[PDB]
């Protein structure tokens, strides 16, 4: 674990992250997709062996020693308000086992279904909350990755609010 686990939000390439492990903003099918999905295919491609998984859903798959968890938020424009809800936070409960079996002391994150997937609206609060209710009882140091300048703004109000 990390020695006093904490959350920080930089607005740069996930691909350029400095920590132990990456979250790939998944697609179902393993396939290189957009936006986040698109980066970590440039960086790490192996990892994209067998990584196809269903929604509310990770798998890690491993680009060297380096551990590429793929997890798979619903696309908004298919699921209801209300299913979409529950494969969110689905998602993200996947991403703490992942990290915790790992033993990693910190993973790169971006904030899942708010780009392409997002059904057009702005999901930041309800992404972001869904991740710190399950990263919450981690003890990883948790990088969340944008790349708006006002998103960045509000992660990290939501991040010093709760300390
Ligand atoms: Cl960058
Ligand atoms: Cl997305
Ligand atoms: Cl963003």
Redo the contacts with the bound molecule.
């Keep these: 674990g990390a020695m006093a686990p904490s959350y920080r939000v930089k607005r740069m390439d996930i691909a350029k992250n400095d920590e132990e492990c990456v979250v790939n903003?998944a697609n179902p099918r393993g396939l290189p997709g957009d936006?986040?999905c698109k980066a970590v295919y440039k960086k790490w491609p192996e990892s994209f062996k067998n990584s196809a998984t269903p929604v509310g859903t990770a798998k890690t798959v491993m680009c060297g020693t380096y551990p590429v968890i793929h997890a798979v938020?619903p696309?908004f424009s298919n699921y209801t308000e209300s299913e979409g809800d529950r494969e969110l936070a689905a998602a993200y409960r996947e991403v703490a086992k992942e990290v915790t079996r790992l033993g990693v002391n910190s993973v790169a994150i971006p904030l899942?279904?708010?780009?392409?997937?997002?059904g057009g609206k702005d999901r930041l609060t309800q992404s972001l909350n869904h991740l710190f209710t399950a990263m919450d009882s981690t003890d990883a140091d948790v990088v969340i990755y944008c790349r708006d300048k006002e998103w960045e703004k509000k992660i990290s109000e939501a991040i010093q609010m709760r300390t």
Excluded: M, Q
């Design positions: 903003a936006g986040v938020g696309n899942l279904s708010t780009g392409v997937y997002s």
